[PDB]
Design a protein around this ligand. Structure first.
Ligand SMILES: Oc1cc(NCc2ccc(F)cc2)cc(-c2nc(N3CCOCC3)c3sccc3n2)c1
Lengths: 993, 277
């Protein structure tokens, strides 16, 4: 709401105006009024009250009040109306302003974008936080100097980057759709202020450069090509087919409509933004870690309290363990079992590990656990993780207090080593007191030069060794056989000893690095020192393989540092945008706030506004989550400070969503028992108001920032049937060439349900599609837009001309009859082809991922024949629990209704040429995803710390291993897939016989 | 007797179960806890020995060549039972000094047989339906408590900020008293002389109105602190209720899993299982 306890104050309200003479003037206000309007009415009435003579003119003063987030905000922008101020209570203090006015407006705008004040970061004691804020500005200034180097073309490249594919080469089936390798393209040109349009139809090669397309248009330096409908430009000199708009038009079979526009006109429209550096920009005895001759021991002093029922629980205790990522470095140690009434221990727990053998990324994972014929169930009450070494390579010492976190929903593990490190900011919380040893004031982890020194010394005692012995053929084949194992396929102890024995030979097959790293004794400084040297000069690998080394099982700084440098060299901005969801979630696994990955992502976010858009929203969506609020908030502060003019565009988006949150909260809470018609009246009445009309019109779509959302078609806006009250919203496309692409932009707003699962599922579908198109299979999937923007707050893209199955049906032949009418004539074959190809990809895609059961409302069909799915509520068969099946179910079962459409009105739909042709497409598609199984496992492994119930552990990710059948042979996996389709179809799915 | 036992009848042999099913059984188990399964049909080797050591699962492949089994060449054991029972009575330090541990605790496939003593299939099938309904009851009960747990945690966080927002307001309203007390002393003292009580009547009326608002705002902040302690007690109360259901959810799941595991044996039809579940 806009006022604490309320949502909106109806115009007639009183406000306590506090003057600098001492008086308190009550004043009648309206909700629409601006500050200079109220300040005119205040100083009008101020003369009645005493001590008027010492008051100055209105122009010298400024309003001040407390906001919803407890900040003393100074309202410089006096055009801001009263309901948009976000006040705590209706009062307004006038004073004379001080300090840097340019900084204070920027800090409030950054604070509004992030969702918390910038002053909250200033009050942080932790030096890691303040070092981050200072040091990260090095990347920010490096980013702006990059995009201002080749100005003003590089200025335009930041704001309007070329949305292109990774590789310029076309697949064969894409190239064959062109006429002798040429596309027919139309370039529109505006005539004058009169606003008439004239087209220039061209016919050119698919690999032409935008400059050469402009050279052909002038027949039919100065100009640049803009996409009609979007705010998307072809500035860079790529092949014309490499752009996603042109590549889509070839597949869809549409005329690409470009707009001729002046280069001087766009360059002048750019902001030419600024980046000001903010205002915050006895001797110690240092001992080395490897000098300490002592085993690790940690004292658990006491736990303050824990929410336990004394009757139901038998005992409580403190479980602890030393962890390198997910792997325990030694045996987990527990405290003595004490009563729930008095949680107190005071005992030195001895861990079987030598302090020098502790690796750089070693972590103390701990929890308070409850206990319940000599059988007992152990359960976690609260959890917490501490990094043994801090961000400056210093080992922890002395006493420290750790406020523990609530256990995540569904986590039955006693410890949570995957979760974030650091104390809970909420102090009204279970607090475990513990004490580490104190040897010196500062115990440091050694430098790389010292590690190399020990590494050479280590291999010397073991019995140029790379080329001393000769690598045999039997050994060379085994290295290939081990590299073919998927990430979660566990290497054996023979294979670990083999991989380590041939660690020097492993450089010849550099994709074996993740297998080689799992073979290292991380509880042994000898082997880690030797691995550090190999990792230093390791041959670089393909970005998709390097993303494995950023998951929770690879916490070492050197291993991660290598992985980030592979992305710097070989990750395209296409594939960065593709995999951005997973790379943002990976930041949760990082030990420290400052790291090589966040610097890489922040630089790419500030040199590419398309990447920076989603980088903002993926971070902003999780700001409610206190496990990552500080990390993500500080990171957003870096972006919002340095991103330039786009912060103003983001605030218009942020303000638009918050107003849609306010109305849907009222509908869910206050209008719960009202009818949907009366709710629509209330909705329309509030949306009609000017503060809502200004906020919810003239801003960029969060689903795609190229899409401009103009005026609301408020009559066509609706509330949906669900109990969470989703809003079916409808905007005009205000672009001058809208009709060629699309006139109206429809988005389903949503406040109750979680859309991270659909966002992931739709990302995976897009990747699955991209694998098939590259391989040769033309299986048209429809990964529609879906972005999560908050705590169960998200947007969904509406597909035009899309109908559910139950709409068409409400007899088995009804679906085939509808599709024949919509595609009546000689274009019937293309519609059945598209339907069959669409069915195949979604039949395979849903089986692998294990999405919720497909009914007629979940399945949808388009006019052209493209089938697609909606509502991926759960996945990886999350409802295997709440039940007891080990079976891999088939969600999308093709009934008689669907088989008739593939078979073209045949009686025996399961025994035709078209169905057998359909079967082969599913088999080729299934094996295509099986061959890229590592990519998907890596992508899911990066999401384990996200907080989704469906992805908490490696047990949950193992569903795709069962459906793809990675432990089995390729042929056995295909025979498995055939049997699963046969069981679901009750014999209808024909066997190889 | 021991070595002459068949590999099928051995308690520690589990057949073609997945590596995930092995990970479930060895989760939070003691050192030397082990079982044997079939090897991956992609990879070389016949069986896989998974055992615990240092809180970690250790996969050791058992190969075969010409009537002999073992971990590496040369293969010296007659059967897999001879290989296992040898390392049940002797350390694996013989094979590899790294993992100095014996095969102490076999994870039996007759483990469920100890718990579910009832022989009849239909009787066990009925208890699975009963245990599943008791599990689903407490599952829906737990979800309802977690819905409250999140909603309560949110509203506490809304209130916690609002308390600080009240305190900033009170600081400003008390700064307004300081603003009055500062500039009123000079003007009231000039007007106490000259016999102008009409001036003091308006100023002291305005001063009382300021203190009246401070009293109300401090009362509103005081009333909010009672709602915070009230709602914080609900958070603690809900967390106690969930931590009592937590262990019941594990046992009801684990027991039902054993009853399902028992019916996985003796080839019970999938149709019957879904009707019971
Ligand atoms: O990614 C998703 C998730 C969910 N689940 C939530 C939900 C549940 C009930 C409900 F009535 C609406 C939404 C729904 C949709 C979803 N999408 C729809 N689409 C309209 C056509 O374009 C694609 C999106 C429609 S049209 C009528 C219902 C509906 N639901 C998409």
């Amino acid at each position: 709401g806009e006022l604490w306890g309320i949502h909106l104050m109806p115009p007639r309200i009183l406000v306590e105006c506090l003057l600098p003479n001492g008086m308190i003037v009550t004043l009648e206000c309206l909700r629409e009024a601006t500050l200079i309007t109220i300040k005119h009415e205040l100083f009008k009435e101020a003369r009645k009250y005493p001590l008027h003579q010492l008051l100055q003119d209105e122009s010298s003063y400024i309003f001040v009040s407390v906001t919803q987030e407890a900040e003393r905000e100074e309202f410089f922008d006096e055009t801001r109306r009263l309901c948009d101020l976000r006040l705590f209570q209706p009062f307004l203090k006038v004073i004379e302003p001080v300090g840097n006015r340019e900084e204070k407006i920027l800090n409030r705008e950054i604070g509004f974008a992030i969702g918390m004040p910038v002053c909250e970061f200033d009050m942080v004691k932790d030096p890691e936080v303040q070092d981050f804020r200072r040091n990260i500005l090095n990347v920010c200034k490096e980013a702006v100097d990059l995009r201002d180097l080749n100005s003003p073309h590089s200025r335009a490249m930041y704001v309007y980057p070329p949305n292109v594919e990774s590789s310029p080469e076309l697949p064969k089936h894409i190239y064959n759709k062109l006429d002798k390798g040429q596309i027919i393209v139309v370039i529109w040109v505006i005539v004058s202020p009169n606003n008439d349009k004239q087209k220039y139809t061209l016919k050119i090669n698919h690999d032409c450069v935008p400059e050469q397309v402009i050279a052909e248009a002038i027949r039919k330096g100065k100009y640049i090509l803009k996409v009609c409908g979007c705010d998307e430009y072809f500035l860079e000199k790529y092949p014309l087919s490499q752009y996603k708009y042109i590549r889509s038009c070839i597949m869809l079979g549409r005329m690409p409509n470009l707009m001729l526009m002046a280069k001087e006109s766009l360059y002048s429209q750019l902001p030419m933004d600024c980046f000001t550096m903010p205002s915050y920009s006895g001797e110690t005895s240092t001992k080395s870690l490897w000098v300490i001759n002592s085993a690790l021991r940690i004292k658990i002093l006491c736990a303050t309290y824990v929410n336990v029922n004394i009757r139901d629980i038998d005992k409580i205790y403190v479980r602890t363990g030393i962890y390198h990522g997910g792997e325990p470095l030694c045996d987990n140690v527990n405290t003595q079992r004490v009563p729930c009434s008095n949680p107190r221990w005071n005992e030195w727990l001895n861990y079987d590990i030598y302090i020098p053998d502790l690796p750089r990324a070693a972590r103390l994972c701990l929890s308070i656990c409850s206990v319940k014929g000599a059988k007992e169930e152990h359960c976690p009450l609260a959890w917490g993780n501490i990094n043994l070494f801090d961000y400056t390579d210093t080992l922890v010492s002395g006493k420290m207090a750790l406020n523990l976190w609530p256990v995540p929903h569904g986590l039955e593990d006693l410890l949570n080593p995957i979760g974030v490190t650091g104390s809970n900011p909420n102090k009204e919380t279970p607090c475990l007191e513990l004490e580490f040893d104190w040897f010196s004031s500062v115990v440091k982890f050694p430098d790389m030069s010292v590690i190399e020194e020990h590494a050479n010394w280590s291999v010397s005692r073991e019995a140029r060794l790379a080329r001393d012995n000769e690598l045999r053929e039997n050994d060379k084949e085994q290295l290939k056989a081990i590299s073919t194992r998927d990430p979660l396929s566990e290497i054996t102890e023979q294979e670990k000893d083999f991989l380590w024995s041939h660690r020097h030979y492993c450089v010849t097959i550099p994709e074996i690095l993740p297998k080689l790293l799992l073979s290292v004794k991380w509880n042994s400084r000898d082997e880690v020192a030797q691995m550090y040297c190999l990792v230093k000069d390791w041959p670089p690998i393909k970005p998709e393989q390097a993303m494995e080394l950023l998951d929770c099982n690879y916490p070492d700084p050197m291993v991660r540092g290598f992985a980030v440098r592979c992305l710097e060299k070989y990750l395209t901005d296409d594939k960065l945008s593709q995999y951005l969801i997973q790379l943002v979630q990976v930041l949760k696994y990082e030990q420290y706030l400052d790291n090589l990955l966040v610097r890489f992502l922040l630089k790419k976010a500030l040199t590419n506004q398309r990447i920076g858009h989603f980088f903002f929203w993926h971070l902003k969506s999780e700001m409610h989550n206190k496990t990552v609020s500080q990390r993500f908030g500080l990171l957003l502060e870096s972006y919002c400070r340095a991103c330039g003019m786009y912060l103003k565009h983001l605030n218009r988006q942020v303000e638009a969503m918050e107003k849609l949150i306010n109305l849907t909260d009222i509908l869910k809470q206050e209008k719960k028992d009202e009818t949907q018609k009366v709710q629509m009246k209330f909705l329309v009445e509030q949306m009609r108001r000017p503060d809502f009309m200004d906020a919810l019109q003239g801003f960029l779509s969060p689903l795609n920032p190229a899409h401009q959302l103009g005026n609301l078609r408020l009559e066509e806006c609706r509330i949906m049937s669900s109990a969470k009250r989703p809003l079916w919203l409808n905007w005009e496309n205000p672009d001058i060439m809208s009709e060629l692409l699309f006139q109206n932009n429809e988005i389903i707003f949503k406040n109750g349900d979680d859309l991270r699962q659909d966002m992931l599922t739709l990302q995976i579908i897009r990747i699955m599609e991209n694998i098939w198109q590259n391989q040769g299979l033309d299986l048209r999937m429809l990964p529609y837009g879906c972005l999560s923007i908050g705590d169960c707050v998200g947007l969904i893209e509406v597909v035009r001309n899309s109908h559910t199955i139950m709409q068409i049906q409400c007899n088995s032949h009804t679906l085939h009859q509808w599709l024949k009418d919509k595609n009546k004539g000689e274009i019937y074959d293309a519609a059945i082809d598209l339907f069959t190809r669409s069915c195949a990809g979604y039949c395979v895609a849903t089986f692998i991922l294990g999405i919720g059961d497909r009914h007629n409302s979940n399945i949808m069909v388009k006019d052209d024949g493209q089938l697609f799915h909606i509502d991926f509520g759960h996945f990886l068969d999350h409802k295997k629990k709440k039940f007891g099946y080990k079976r891999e179910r088939v969600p999308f079962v093709l009934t008689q209704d669907f088989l008739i459409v593939i078979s073209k009105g045949a009686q025996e739909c399961t025994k035709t040429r078209e169905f057998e042709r359909f079967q082969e497409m599913c088999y080729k598609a299934y094996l295509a995803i099986r061959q890229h199984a590592n990519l998907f496992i890596n992508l899911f492994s990066m999401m384990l710390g996200s907080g989704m119930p469906e992805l908490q552990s490696f047990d949950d990710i193992a569903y795709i291993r069962k459906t793809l059948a990675l432990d089995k042979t390729e042929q056995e996996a295909l025979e498995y897939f055939m049997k699963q389709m046969n069981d679901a179809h009750h014999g209808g799915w024909t066997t190889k016989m | 007797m021991n070595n002459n036992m068949s590999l099928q009848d051995a308690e520690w042999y589990w057949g073609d179960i997945s590596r995930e099913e092995v990970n479930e059984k060895l989760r939070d188990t003691a050192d030397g806890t082990f079982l044997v399964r079939d090897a991956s049909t992609k990879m070389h080797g016949d069986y896989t020995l998974t055992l615990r050591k240092g809180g970690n699962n250790k996969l050791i492949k058992i190969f075969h060549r010409d009537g002999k089994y073992g971990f590496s060449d040369p293969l010296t054991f007659s059967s897999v039972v001879e290989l296992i029972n040898h390392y049940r009575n002797e350390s694996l330090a013989q094979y590899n000094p790294k993992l100095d541990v014996k095969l102490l605790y076999p994870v039996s496939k007759y483990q469920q047989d100890q718990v579910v003593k009832e022989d009849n299939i239909e009787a066990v099938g009925k208890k699975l339906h009963e245990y599943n309904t008791q599990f689903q009851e407490k599952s829906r009960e737990y979800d309802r408590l977690y819905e409250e747990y999140t909603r309560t945690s949110q509203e506490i966080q809304m209130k916690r900020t609002a308390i600080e927002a009240f305190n900033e307001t009170i600081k400003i309203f008390e700064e307004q008293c300081q603003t009055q007390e500062r500039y009123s002393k000079e003007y009231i003292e000039k007007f106490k002389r000259e016999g102008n009580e009409k001036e003091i009547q308006r100023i002291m009326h305005n001063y009382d109105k300021l203190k009246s608002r401070i009293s109300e705002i401090i009362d509103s902040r005081r009333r909010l602190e009672e709602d915070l302690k009230k709602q914080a007690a609900e958070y603690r109360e809900i967390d106690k209720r969930m931590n009592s259901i937590k262990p019941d959810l594990i046992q009801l799941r684990k027991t039902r899993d054993q009853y399902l595991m028992w019916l996985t044996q003796k080839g019970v039809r999938q149709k019957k299982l879904n009707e019971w579940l």
